[PDB]
Amino acid sequence: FEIRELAICTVGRLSSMNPAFVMPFLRKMLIQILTELEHSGIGRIKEQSARMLGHLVSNAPRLIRPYMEPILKALILKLKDPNP
Amino acid sequence: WRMKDRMKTVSVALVLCLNVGVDPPDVVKTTPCARLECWIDPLSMGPQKALETIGANLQKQYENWQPRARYKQSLD
Amino acid sequence: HTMVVQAITFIFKSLGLKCVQFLPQVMPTFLNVIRVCDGAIREFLFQQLGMLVSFVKSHIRPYMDEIVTLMREFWVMNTSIQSTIILLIEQIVVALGGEFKLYLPQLIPHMLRVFMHDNSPGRIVSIKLLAAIQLFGANLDDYLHLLLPPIVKLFDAPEAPLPSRKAALETVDRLT
Amino acid sequence: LAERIMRSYNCTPVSSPRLPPTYMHAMWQAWDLAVDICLSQLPTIIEEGTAFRHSPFFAEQLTAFQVWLTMGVENR
Amino acid sequence: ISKQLPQLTSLELQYVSPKLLMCRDLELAVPGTYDPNQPIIRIQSIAPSLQVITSKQRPRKLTLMGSNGHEFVFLLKGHEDLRQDERV
């Protein structure tokens, strides 16, 4: 999982150099992370998904800025759910 | 890299065995089923009128890609 | 219970594809009955409902959400109930096909929990769930990243039984 | 596109010259991204009536081509 | 238009009058239903489709939805007076 975090951080860091190859792949990974958070009822998986989402937010603001609303809505829905 | 030959689609044949208003015996469709053929609802404007309209619309759709072709429609 | 349900299933089988007419009459009552049933009748009712869905194929869409809700409510650690629900899942996916991807995420947590903890002898429940995942087909494209790591851990764990890891490898190969 | 769409409904379009499958190609992700970016402005275009800005897809692709050319001396 | 007329089997609100299709939860009571003692049954919604009867006069078959939840089917008579029928 840590290698995944480092890789996604590196890829998001490269989103400005080669947007054409990175932005679509990062959009797909964002979709996968979001559905993981929404559907997987596992603490470890959801925690890893949230960590990957945070790394993606930190490293690729430009890709996520159009998608700020759904990500925020999903995080809010997660917050309203009844692991630290 | 040279093009060996330039072929042209002179004519287009549009056979539409839609059979408006009658369901084929093989498939029993659901009550809603699928009613959009070439973005036209057959049941709204009557069987023959819908068949002709769908044929004309499909001819227009093909003309959108190949305007220069002879289009002859066969309806059932 | 068993008498009337067997009669209903036999009539639906005999009618063939014309049995769709009786869906509005039977489906809501059947779902309510399965909801309010108790004891060993539950698994038999789920099996007969699977047979009914197999007969009905694409016309079971309106009641599919309620069927999924019932399955989620009544899915427990019991081996027999899990097996019956897996068979019902296989019949559902072979009935619907493309549209099953809509209802798959609801069922995903139960499969994930089964993969996480399965004390069945030989992990036969896990093997049957692997077969169901094989039958899933193209509907798993939007959720492969979720189901795959459980199977990966399944066929990579040395402690897992050999037939279970063989089933996992076959499932991955088929999904490929 | 028809093959990609039909794959999601357990339908496999067939061509007389067998084409290798193309539903998994990464370019479809770029297609989806461009479609989403373009249609995100539609609520403002129809209701508010803003000026439709051009999609940066081609600019990004040319930037990627330039990046390739920067190191693409080798016959890779 | 004579050729077109038989094909006009049914009429949809979005074509003939989107104004009615817009109408929702009107305080206006269902016609011929108001009573000084009974509670007012105001119009809830109008069905999008009207099934025109294939007759010489081609009367429409309008169906309304009441606030009480009960449908009220009506026949839209055209080019004929109804005051006489009112007195009758």
Side-chain angles (χ1 to χ4, degrees):
Chain A
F1 172 53
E2 187 65 31
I3 284 177
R4 298 166 52 181
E5 310 173 52
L6 180 54
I8 187 187
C9 291
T10 298
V11 170
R13 177 166 48 96
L14 265 61
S15 60
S16 300
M17 325 304 176
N18 191 328
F21 280 84
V22 176
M23 297 182 63
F25 181 83
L26 284 195
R27 174 185 177 276
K28 176 188 180 57
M29 299 318 297
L30 171 60
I31 271 297
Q32 294 192 356
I33 291 172
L34 285 179
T35 180
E36 283 184 17
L37 194 143
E38 287 292 318
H39 299 158
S40 179
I42 301 177
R44 167 57 50 89
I45 293 198
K46 280 191 292 184
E47 175 185 357
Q48 290 184 345
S49 169
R51 184 57 176 175
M52 291 286 285
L53 181 58
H55 283 299
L56 195 59
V57 171
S58 64
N59 286 89
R62 195 162 317 280
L63 188 271
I64 293 200
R65 187 165 299 172
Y67 303 146
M68 190 279 302
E69 166 64 27
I71 297 174
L72 177 57
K73 210 168 190 174
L75 293 176
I76 283 303
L77 294 179
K78 196 273 170 180
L79 293 175
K80 304 298 292 297
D81 291 348
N83 188 274
Chain B
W1 71 271
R2 290 289 191 174
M3 185 64 58
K4 307 307 295 173
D5 57 321
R6 171 63 74 98
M7 295 290 98
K8 290 296 300 175
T9 61
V10 175
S11 177
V12 182
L14 301 179
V15 178
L16 282 70
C17 302
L18 305 181
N19 190 223
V20 179
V22 178
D23 302 2
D26 289 14
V27 180
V28 173
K29 309 173 183 179
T30 326
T31 301
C33 87
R35 59 191 66 260
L36 289 77
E37 290 80 359
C38 300
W39 311 106
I40 297 185
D41 196 333
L43 277 66
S44 60
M45 57 179 62
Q48 183 60 40
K49 176 60 177 55
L51 186 49
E52 301 171 7
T53 311
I54 294 179
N57 201 336
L58 183 55
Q59 171 173 341
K60 168 177 50 59
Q61 303 282 34
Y62 271 87
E63 287 170 358
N64 200 330
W65 300 110
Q66 180 55 268
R68 301 181 179 183
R70 281 182 173 84
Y71 295 78
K72 294 186 172 60
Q73 308 174 7
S74 295
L75 303 180
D76 300 3
Chain C
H1 253 105
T2 165
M3 318 303 296
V4 70
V5 175
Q6 283 166 311
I8 289 179
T9 53
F10 187 88
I11 290 183
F12 272 75
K13 181 192 305 176
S14 179
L15 288 178
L17 81 179
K18 288 184 299 299
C19 71
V20 56
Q21 312 158 12
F22 309 92
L23 285 177
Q25 306 178 9
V26 182
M27 285 305 298
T29 74
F30 208 154
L31 297 175
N32 277 267
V33 159
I34 286 159
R35 178 185 304 277
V36 303
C37 269
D38 296 310
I41 194 55
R42 186 91 43 74
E43 52 185 9
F44 173 77
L45 286 203
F46 275 118
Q47 166 191 352
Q48 297 296 276
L49 181 60
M51 298 299 295
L52 168 65
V53 172
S54 67
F55 299 150
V56 165
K57 50 200 57 179
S58 176
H59 309 265
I60 200 58
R61 271 187 290 99
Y63 324 100
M64 195 61 253
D65 53 338
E66 312 181 25
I67 300 176
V68 167
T69 303
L70 264 63
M71 290 147 50
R72 292 226 317 273
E73 292 182 5
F74 294 103
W75 202 332
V76 296
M77 190 55 188
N78 181 23
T79 300
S80 60
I81 295 186
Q82 284 164 339
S83 59
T84 308
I85 294 185
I86 288 181
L87 181 55
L88 171 56
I89 279 290
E90 295 184 351
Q91 301 188 82
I92 284 166
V93 304
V94 304
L96 294 183
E99 295 80 358
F100 173 75
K101 67 177 182 181
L102 210 166
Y103 310 93
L104 178 59
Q106 291 84 326
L107 312 153
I108 282 179
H110 300 270
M111 303 169 185
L112 263 294
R113 294 164 186 175
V114 168
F115 286 144
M116 283 184 44
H117 47 71
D118 184 16
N119 49 31
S120 178
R123 311 191 71 175
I124 52 99
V125 184
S126 301
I127 298 179
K128 295 156 56 66
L129 191 50
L130 267 31
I133 289 171
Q134 277 181 147
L135 295 182
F136 280 167
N139 298 329
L140 205 60
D141 63 329
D142 217 342
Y143 309 98
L144 175 58
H145 56 262
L146 276 166
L147 282 300
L148 182 58
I151 312 175
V152 160
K153 176 168 49 61
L154 254 54
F155 83 85
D156 191 65
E159 62 90 13
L162 295 180
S164 182
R165 302 207 301 174
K166 290 179 170 183
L169 288 179
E170 170 65 26
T171 294
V172 174
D173 155 72
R174 196 274 172 186
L175 290 181
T176 312
Chain D
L1 173 69
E3 181 175 16
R4 172 156 183 266
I5 295 183
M6 288 287 189
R7 185 195 65 92
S8 58
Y9 305 95
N10 285 18
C11 305
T12 303
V14 189
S15 60
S16 181
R18 206 277 167 169
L19 303 187
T22 53
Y23 56 83
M24 78 302 294
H25 197 281
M27 212 60 54
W28 290 107
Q29 307 146 356
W31 162 245
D32 296 336
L33 170 60
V35 168
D36 216 20
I37 292 187
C38 184
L39 72 86
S40 56
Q41 311 163 31
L42 260 58
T44 56
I45 288 286
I46 276 76
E47 308 174 11
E48 190 270 347
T50 180
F52 163 74
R53 78 213 72 174
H54 280 45
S55 299
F57 164 77
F58 288 121
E60 296 165 0
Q61 292 295 338
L62 268 306
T63 309
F65 185 75
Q66 184 185 46
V67 169
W68 188 99
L69 289 183
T70 323
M71 332 288 181
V73 182
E74 186 57 37
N75 198 328
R76 57 204 298 266
Chain E
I1 193 46
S2 302
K3 297 173 182 178
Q4 171 70 281
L5 174 141
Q7 302 298 299
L8 304 179
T9 301
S10 180
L11 269 60
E12 191 84 324
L13 257 57
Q14 56 179 351
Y15 313 137
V16 185
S17 175
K19 179 72 68 60
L20 293 173
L21 197 57
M22 183 274 312
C23 294
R24 291 297 108 89
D25 310 69
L26 270 64
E27 58 164 6
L28 180 267
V30 183
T33 325
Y34 177 74
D35 180 79
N37 313 332
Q38 312 306 319
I40 294 168
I41 300 303
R42 51 188 46 83
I43 296 187
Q44 183 67 30
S45 61
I46 310 182
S49 297
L50 310 183
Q51 191 274 118
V52 180
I53 301 290
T54 61
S55 294
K56 187 174 185 176
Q57 333 298 332
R58 301 177 311 280
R60 278 70 177 176
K61 185 181 298 292
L62 163 135
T63 148
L64 302 181
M65 170 52 70
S67 56
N68 52 346
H70 305 68
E71 299 189 14
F72 295 94
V73 192
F74 294 91
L75 292 184
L76 277 171
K77 289 293 187 299
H79 51 69
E80 64 174 48
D81 187 13
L82 293 193
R83 301 167 300 181
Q84 177 67 23
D85 298 338
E86 178 56 87
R87 304 308 175 95
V88 167

